C-alpha cells in the first residue's frame, strides 16, 4: 500500500486514497483491491490500462479531480467494474466514445457534471446492465439517435441541467425498462411526435425549465404507467395547439403540475389543467 | 526500498541467462518490476517490465530471446533469456515502478548485475 | 519508430558556471489535454546506478536539489545546472515514457580545474 492511503480486507479488499493531493493515478495498488477511491484528489489523466492488474475491481471512484482526459482503454481489464464515478471533474470535456467498451457487469455510471459538449456515437454501446446513469450539469448540445439503445436495464436517466435543444424521434430507443426520467433545466425547444415509444414503464418525468411552447397530440400516451409529471415554467402557447395536450391532462389520474401559459397575451400565468376548452382559440 | 540482481555472470554463446532480481520495501502484487540493460560503455536499454498483475511487456527487438516471469511468495523476478551473442554484454539493472503512472520512472535500481557474453 | 537524441555526448566546464543539455525525441511527447509531458531525467554517476532527476519534463523528484531545472514542450528538453558541484560529477540520461520506454544515449559532465 502507497504513502497515506488506507488499506482493510473487510468487507471488501479497499484502497482508500481520498484528497491525498495526488497528481495523478498512484503506483502501488494491490491487484487483489476490490474497490479503489482515488477522488477529492489533483488527477488529470487516467493513463492507457491504469487499473489493468485489478481484475476484481467492482467500485472505482475518481470523481473531484482535475481529468482533462480519461484515454481510451483506461478502463481495460476490468471485467467485473459496477460501479463507476468520474464527476465534480469540471474541465473534462469528452470521452473516447469506446472508452466503456466491455464494461459489462457494470450497474451504475456517473458522469454528472463534467462540461461534456459531445455524446460520442455508441459510447453507452453494450452496457447491457447499467442501470442509473447520471449526466447532468454538463453542455450536451444534442442528443444522437439511438445513444442509449443498448441499455437493457436503465431504470434512473439523468440529463438535466443541460444545454438540449431539441429530442429527436429514436433518442430514447431502446429504454425498455426505464423508470425515472429528467430533463428539466434544458433550452429545449420541440419534442418528436413518436419521441417516447419505447417507454413502457416510465413513472417520473420532469421537463419544466425548458423552452417547450407546446407538445403535439402523439407524445404523451405512450407512458402507460406515468405517475409524476412536471411542465411548469415553459413558454407555453396556449391555444389550439394545445387542445390536444389540454384533453391529455383531464384523463391523466395521477399526478401533473400546473402548466402555465403565457401566449396569447390575453391568458397569462393561467394554469391550463383549469381552463375550459372553448378557452382555447382557433384555428 | 531496494532490488538486488544475482546469479550467472559469464554466458557462452549460443546459450541461456538466468538472472534473479530479489526486493525489500514493497511486494510484487502492489508494484511491478523492469529490466534495463546497459553496455560497458553505451548508453541504456529498456528491455522488458512484468506487471503487478501477471501481464508481461518485452521490446521484441530481441526477437524470440527473452521472458519475464516472477514468483509472488518468493518475493523474486526471474529474467531469462537464450540464445545471445556478444552483442548483450552489458550490465543487467533491474529497476522499479511499475506503472500506470505516478509512483516511480526507474526511480529505484539496483546496483547492476555485469554479464559477459563469451566462451 | 521512437527515438531520442542527445547532444553534446560530453562538455566540460568548471564549477559554478550554468549549463544546459539537449534532448530532442522522435515523436512529440506532449498529452494533448493536460499538457504534462511524459520525459524524465537520470543521473548515472560512475559506478553507480542511474538515479531520477526529473520526470514530468519539469518536476523534481524528492531530494534532488533545488539547483537543477528541465524544460521544453514536446520534443525540445533542456537540463540545466546552474552553479555545477564538484559532487555533480556523472553522466545524464534523459528517458522517454510515452511509447514505453526509450532512452538516450547521454551526455557526460568534465569539470574544469
Known amino acids: 500500500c502507497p504513502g497515506a492511503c488506507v488499506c482493510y480486507n473487510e468487507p471488501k479488499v479497499t484502497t482508500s486514497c481520498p484528497q491525498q493531493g495526488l497528481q495523478a493515478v498512484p503506483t502501488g495498488i494491490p491487484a487483489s483491491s476490490q474497490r479503489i477511491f482515488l477522488h477529492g484528489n489533483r488527477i488529470s489523466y487516467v493513463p492507457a490500462a491504469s487499473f489493468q492488474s485489478c481484475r476484481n475491481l467492482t467500485i472505482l471512484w475518481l470523481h473531484s479531480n482535475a481529468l482533462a482526459g480519461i484515454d481510451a482503454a483506461a478502463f481495460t481489464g476490468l471485467t467485473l467494474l459496477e460501479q463507476l464515478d468520474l464527476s465534480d471533474n469540471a474541465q473534462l470535456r469528452v470521452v473516447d466514445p469506446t472508452t466503456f467498451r466491455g464494461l459489462g457487469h457494470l450497474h451504475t455510471l456517473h458522469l454528472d457534471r463534467c462540461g461534456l459538449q459531445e455524446l460520442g456515437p455508441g459510447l453507452f454501446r453494450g452496457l447491457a446492465a447499467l442501470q442509473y446513469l447520471y449526466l447532468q450539469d454538463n453542455n450536451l448540445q444534442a442528443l444522437p439517435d439511438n445513444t442509449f439503445r443498448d441499455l437493457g436495464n436503465l431504470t434512473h436517466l439523468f440529463l438535466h441541467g443541460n444545454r438540449i435543444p431539441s429530442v429527436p424521434e429514436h433518442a430514447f430507443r431502446g429504454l425498455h425498462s426505464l423508470d425515472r426520467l429528467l430533463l428539466h433545466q434544458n433550452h429545449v425547444a420541440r419534442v418528436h411526435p413518436h419521441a417516447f415509444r419505447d417507454l413502457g414503464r416510465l413513472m417520473t418525468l420532469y421537463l419544466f425549465a425548458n423552452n417547450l411552447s407546446m407538445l403535439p397530440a402523439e407524445v404523451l400516451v405512450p407512458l402507460r404507467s406515468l405517475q409524476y409529471l412536471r411542465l411548469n415554467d415553459n413558454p407555453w402557447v396556449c391555444d389550439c395547439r394545445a387542445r390536444p395536450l389540454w384533453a391529455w391532462l383531464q384523463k391523466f389520474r395521477g399526478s401533473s403540475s400546473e402548466v402555465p401559459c403565457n401566449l396569447p397575451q390575453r391568458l397569462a400565468g393561467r394554469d391550463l389543467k383549469r381552463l375550459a376548452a372553448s378557452d382555447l382559440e382557433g384555428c | 526500498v531496494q532490488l538486488k540482481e544475482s546469479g550467472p555472470g559469464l554466458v557462452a554463446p549460443s546459450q541461456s541467462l538466468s538472472i534473479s532480481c530479489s526486493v525489500s520495501?514493497?511486494?510484487?502484487?502492489?508494484?511491478?518490476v523492469h529490466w534495463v540493460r546497459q553496455s560497458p560503455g553505451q548508453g541504456l536499454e529498456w528491455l522488458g517490465v512484468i506487471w503487478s498483475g501477471g501481464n508481461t511487456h518485452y521490446n521484441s527487438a530481441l526477437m524470440s530471446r527473452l521472458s519475464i516471469s516472477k514468483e509472488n511468495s518468493k518475493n523474486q523476478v526471474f529474467l531469462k533469456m537464450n540464445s545471445l551473442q556478444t552483442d548483450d554484454t552489458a550490465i543487467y539493472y533491474c529497476?522499479?515502478?511499475?506503472?500506470?503512472?505516478?509512483?516511480?520512472?526507474?526511480?529505484?535500481w539496483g546496483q547492476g548485475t555485469l554479464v559477459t557474453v563469451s566462451a | 519508430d521512437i527515438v531520442m537524441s542527445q547532444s553534446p555526448s560530453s562538455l566540460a566546464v568548471s564549477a559554478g558556471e550554468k549549463v544546459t543539455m539537449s534532448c530532442k525525441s522522435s515523436?512529440?511527447?506532449?498529452?494533448?489535454?493536460?499538457?504534462?509531458?511524459?520525459l524524465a531525467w537520470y543521473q548515472q554517476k560512475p559506478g553507480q546506478s542511474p538515479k531520477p532527476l526529473i520526470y514530468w519534463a519539469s518536476t523534481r523528484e524528492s531530494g534532488v536539489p533545488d539547483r537543477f531545472t528541465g524544460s521544453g514542450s514536446g520534443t525540445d528538453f533542456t537540463l540545466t545546472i546552474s552553479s555545477v558541484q564538484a559532487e555533480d560529477l556523472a553522466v545524464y540520461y534523459c528517458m522517454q515514457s510515452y511509447n514505453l520506454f526509450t532512452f538516450g544515449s547521454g551526455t557526460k559532465l568534465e569539470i574544469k580545474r
Open positions: 529497476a522499479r515502478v511499475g506503472i500506470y503512472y505516478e509512483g516511480a520512472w526507474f526511480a529505484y
Open positions: 515523436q512529440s511527447l506532449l498529452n494533448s489535454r493536460n499538457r504534462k509531458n511524459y
Open positions: 520495501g514493497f511486494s510484487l502484487s502492489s508494484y511491478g
